[PDB]
Amino acid sequence: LHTQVGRGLLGAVVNPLGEVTDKFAVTDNSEILYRPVDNAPPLYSERAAIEKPFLTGIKVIDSLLTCGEGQRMGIFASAGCGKTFLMNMLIEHSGADIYVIGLIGERGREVTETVDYLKNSEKKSRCVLVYATSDYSSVDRCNAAYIATAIAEFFRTEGHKVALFIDSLTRYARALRDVALAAGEVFDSLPRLLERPGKLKAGGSITAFYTVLLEFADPLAEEVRSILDGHIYLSRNLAQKGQFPAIDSLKSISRVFTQVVDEKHRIMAAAFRELLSEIEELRTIIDFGEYKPGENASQDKIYNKISVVESFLKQDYRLGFTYEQTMELIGETIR
């Protein structure tokens, strides 16, 4: 019912009991405090409207799927779609004050994988990791998500710009289904957990990224899609083509997009999406064997744009782009 919070947790790995079990970085601060893991979400009059972009350093997200401070964003992917590599890029190339990672997983190898990534990350002294493996009970698996959220909420009240990562909502929902059965069934826990992020008028912000594993979409993908403020789809087909990040721009959205980017930006993003739509249309004509050079000048122009459009979309995972670099690059692609 209560957990450790404070700057003393920076660099620490926290298990479903709230105890520090490992450290991936050591910090000056020793402030440790105690707060309850669940408390009510901010009243509607305490939330601020989402108005400021949360820059990720990822070209396709920052230009076409621009996130906002306080926004809750879903990441939908099947296994083997680079879900973990995208989250590592989000941590590495964004500009949050503090990163809180909650791993609701099965195998301990995944926890060590993240601890090893954090151990060599430039953001390591601003991160807290909460984990729960398969050996832990369903109750402990759920509490890992509440501990991570409460840790992020303390940093929000201190005024920090916080990024929260829950991986995954799917395995969290499974454990919540088991905890229900123990009561004879409490699923109401999902919206309650997901309304806690946001920007407070009197404090900082929690920008939250929730992972959802796809089979095709579970009812769990459909519900979760409707409460969040946007979703990124990781296309297994685009992954097999060698495109990383495997983000399907045309199937992804950020519902706060028009409120967090200016008018010049919105014009370039709309022109780029129309270019993507023409390219995927041209791809089908090519697969049909109906494209033949020199016959349709419109198709030839689209065809000659494919290489630099693909170049704009792809991104080395160790590289991050400023907002000015991204808008400059997308300008060249649409000319």
Curated annotation (Swiss-Prot):
It is found in: Cytoplasm. Changing L214A: Decrease in ATPase activity. This is Type 3 secretion system ATPase. The lineage of its organism: Bacteria, Pseudomonadati, Pseudomonadota, Gammaproteobacteria, Enterobacterales. Belongs to the ATPase alpha/beta chains family. T3SS ATPase subfamily. GO terms for biological process: protein secretion by the type III secretion system. Its main location: cytoplasm. Its EC number is 7.4.2.8. Changing F85A: Decrease in ATPase activity. The N-terminal domain is required for oligomerization and ATPase activity. The six N-terminal residues are necessary for proper oligomer formation, though their absence does not entirely preclude oligomerization. The extreme N-terminus is also required for interaction with MxiN/SctL. The N-terminal domain, not ATPase activity, is responsible for localization of Spa47/SctN to the injectisome. The binding of ATP induces a conformational change of a highly conserved luminal loop, facilitating ATP hydrolysis. It is an enzyme of class 7 (translocase). Changing E195R: Reduces oligomerization. Lack of ATPase activity. Abolishes invasion and hemolysis phenotype. Low levels of secreted IpaC. Disruption phenotype: Mutant is defective for assembly of the needle and secretion of the translocon proteins IpaB/SctE and IpaC/SctB. Amount of the needle filament protein MxiH/SctF is greatly reduced. T3SS effector protein secretion is reduced in Shigella strains coexpressing wild-type and inactive Spa47/SctN. ATP binds at G80, C81, G82, K83, T84, F85. ATPase component of the type III secretion system (T3SS), also called injectisome, which is used to inject bacterial effector proteins into eukaryotic host cells. Acts as a molecular motor to provide the energy that is required for the export of proteins. Required for type III secretion apparatus (T3SA) formation, proper protein secretion, host cell invasion and virulence. May play a critical role in T3SS substrate recognition, disassembly of the effector/chaperone complex and unfolding of the effector in an ATP-dependent manner prior to secretion. Oligomerization increases ATPase activity. Monomeric forms exhibit low-level ATPase activity by forming short-lived oligomers with active site contributions from at least two protomers. In contrast, oligomers exhibit enhanced ATP hydrolysis rates that likely result from multiple preformed active sites within the oligomeric complex. Oligomerization is important for both enzyme activation and T3SS function. Changing R255A: Lack of ATPase activity. Mutant is unable to form external MxiH/SctF needles and to restore the invasion phenotype in a knockout strain. Keywords: ATP-binding, Cytoplasm, Nucleotide-binding, Plasmid, Protein transport, Translocase, Transport, Virulence. It catalyses: ATP + H2O + cellular proteinSide 1 = ADP + phosphate + cellular proteinSide 2. One of its GO terms (molecular function) is ATP hydrolysis activity. It comes from the Bacteria. Changing R109A: Abolishes oligomerization. Lack of ATPase activity. Abolishes invasion and hemolysis phenotype. Cannot secrete IpaC. One of its GO terms (cellular component) is cytoplasm.
